[PDB]
């Protein structure tokens, strides 16, 4: 039964990653926190 | 000349680089091109438009 529960539990996690898109923001914000500031640097090339 | 690292002076505006043909369709009024950094990247040639 333990094994059954364990197997079932694993499948739910995959579904929980197959469903929710907002969980992984803790990674993606980091990517955004490089994809945001860098771009602004380029815009300071157009300051008189 | 195309695809050559050269010095250009188009209508006063100067610089260096390589020149190629764009597939860009302007409006008949439009002449220049500018970037995010407010830099030139696409120019209409004064002789052969």
Curated annotation (Swiss-Prot), chain B:
Subunit text: Binds to host ACE2. RBD also interacts with the N-linked glycan on 'Asn-90' of ACE2. Cleavage of S generates a polybasic C-terminal sequence on S1 that binds to host Neuropilin-1 (NRP1) and Neuropilin-2 (NRP2) receptors. Interacts with host integrin alpha-5/beta-1 (ITGA5:ITGB1) and with ACE2 in complex with integrin alpha-5/beta-1 (ITGA5:ITGB1). May interact via cytoplasmic c-terminus with M protein. May interact (via N-terminus) with host bilirubin and biliverdin, thereby preventing antibody binding to the SARS-CoV-2 spike NTD via an allosteric mechanism.
Changing residue 37 to D: what effect?
A: In strain: Alpha/B.1.1.7
Q: What is this protein for, i.e. what is its function?
A: Attaches the virion to the cell membrane by interacting with host receptor, initiating the infection. The major receptor is host ACE2. When S2/S2' has been cleaved, binding to the receptor triggers direct fusion at the cell membrane. When S2/S2' has not been cleaved, binding to the receptor results in internalization of the virus by endocytosis using host TFRC and GRM2 and leading to fusion of the virion membrane with the host endosomal membrane. Alternatively, may use NRP1/NRP2 and integrin as entry receptors.
Recorded name of the encoding gene: S
Impact after mutating residue 14 to K: In strain: Omicron/BA.1
Q: Name the chain's protein.
A: Spike protein S1
């Amino acid at each position: 039964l333990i094994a059954n529960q364990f197997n079932s539990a694993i499948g739910k996690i995959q579904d929980s990653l197959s469903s929710t898109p907002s969980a992984l923001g803790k990674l993606q914000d980091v990517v955004n926190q490089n994809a945001q500031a860098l771009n602004t640097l380029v815009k300071q090339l157009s300051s008189n | 000349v195309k695809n050559k690292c050269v010095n250009f002076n188009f209508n006063g505006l100067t610089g260096t680089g390589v020149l190629t043909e764009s597939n860009k369709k302007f409006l008949p009024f439009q002449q220049f091109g500018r970037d995010i950094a407010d830099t030139t990247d696409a120019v209409r040639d004064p002789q052969t438009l």
